[PDB]
C-alpha cells in the first residue's frame, strides 16, 4: 500500500519535477504519480514499449512517455544489475530538455524527471535507489 510515500520522498528534494509508480504486469496502470505533470498520463500502450521485446528502435527513433517524445541515452532496463533506462526529453527550437530515468522492479516501473539543469546521474541515482528500496518489499 501507500504508493504516494514513494512519490513524496522522490519529490521532497525540489530538484525533480515529475515522478510516478507504474505497475506493468498484465494490465499496465499508473499506481502513483504527480498530479498535473506528464507521467500521470502514461498509457498501457507506452508501458508496453518500455518493457517491450523490440529495443532496436530505441537509440535511433526514441519513444514517448505520457505523450511526451523522448530520446534514449542508455537502456539496461531488462539487463540485470542495472534495470534502469536513461532518456532526455525531446525539444525543438532551443527549448530546455530534461533528464528522465526509468527503473524496473519486480512489479513496477519507477519513473523520474529532473528540473532544468539537474545532472542525469543524479536523476538516475535517485531512481535506482528508490527501485532498490521497493524490490525489498518485494514490489
Swiss-Prot record:
Q: Where in the cell is it found?
A: Cytoplasm, Cytoskeleton
Q: Identify residues that carry Phosphoserine.
A: 27, 56, 84, 137
Entry keywords, A to Z: Acetylation, Actin-binding, Amyotrophic lateral sclerosis, Cytoplasm, Cytoskeleton, Disease variant, Isopeptide bond, Neurodegeneration, Phosphoprotein, Ubl conjugation
Q: Name one Pfam family in it.
A: Profilin
- Coiled-coil blocks: none
Modified positions (Phosphotyrosine) in chain numbering: 128
- In-chain residues carrying the UniProt-annotated modification N6-acetyllysine: 104, 107
Crosslinked residue numbers (Glycyl lysine isopeptide (Lys-Gly) (interchain with G-Cter in SUMO2)): 53
Q: Does the keyword Cytoplasm apply?
A: yes
Q: Which InterPro entries match?
A: PFN, PFN_euk, PFN_sf, Profilin1/2/3_vertebrate, Profilin_CS
Post-translational modification note: Phosphorylation at Ser-137 reduces its affinity for G-actin and blocks its interaction with HTT, reducing its ability to inhibit androgen receptor (AR) and HTT aggregation.
Which biological process annotations from GO are given for this protein?
actin cytoskeleton organization; modification of postsynaptic actin cytoskeleton; modulation of chemical synaptic transmission; negative regulation of actin filament bundle assembly; negative regulation of actin filament polymerization; negative regulation of stress fiber assembly; neural tube closure; positive regulation of actin filament bundle assembly
Record-listed cross-link Glycyl lysine isopeptide (Lys-Gly) (interchain with G-Cter in ubiquitin), residues: 53
The primary site where this protein sits is cytoplasm
Q: In which tissues is it expressed?
A: Expressed in epididymis (at protein level).
Keyword set includes Cytoplasm: yes
Gene Ontology MF terms = actin binding; actin monomer binding; adenyl-nucleotide exchange factor activity; cadherin binding; phosphatidylinositol-4,5-bisphosphate binding; phosphotyrosine residue binding; proline-rich region binding; RNA binding
| Residues annotated with N-acetylalanine modification | 1
Task: State the PROSITE patterns in the record.
Answer: PROFILIN (PS00414)
Q: Which disease is it linked to?
A: Amyotrophic lateral sclerosis 18: A neurodegenerative disorder affecting upper motor neurons in the brain and lower motor neurons in the brain stem and spinal cord, resulting in fatal paralysis. Sensory abnormalities are absent. The pathologic hallmarks of the disease include pallor of the corticospinal tract due to loss of motor neurons, presence of ubiquitin-positive inclusions within surviving motor neurons, and deposition of pathologic aggregates. The etiology of amyotrophic lateral sclerosis is likely to be multifactorial, involving both genetic and environmental factors.
**Family, per entry:** Belongs to the profilin family.
Official protein name in the record: Profilin-1
Gene name tied to this protein: PFN1
Amino acid at each position: 500500500a501507500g504508493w504516494n510515500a514513494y512519490i513524496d520522498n522522490l519529490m521532497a528534494d525540489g530538484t525533480c519535477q515529475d515522478a510516478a509508480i507504474v505497475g506493468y504486469k498484465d494490465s499496465p496502470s499508473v499506481w502513483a504519480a504527480v498530479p498535473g505533470k506528464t507521467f500521470v498520463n502514461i498509457t498501457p500502450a507506452e508501458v508496453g514499449v518500455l518493457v517491450g521485446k523490440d529495443r532496436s528502435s530505441f537509440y535511433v527513433n526514441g519513444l514517448t512517455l505520457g505523450g511526451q517524445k523522448c530520446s534514449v541515452i542508455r537502456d539496461s532496463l531488462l539487463q540485470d544489475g542495472e534495470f534502469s533506462m536513461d532518456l532526455r526529453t525531446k525539444s525543438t527550437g532551443g527549448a530546455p530538455t530534461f533528464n528522465v530515468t526509468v527503473t524496473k522492479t519486480d512489479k513496477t516501473l519507477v519513473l523520474l524527471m529532473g528540473k532544468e539543469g539537474v545532472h542525469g546521474g543524479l536523476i538516475n541515482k535517485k531512481c535506482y535507489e528508490m527501485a532498490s528500496h521497493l524490490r525489498r518489499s518485494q514490489y
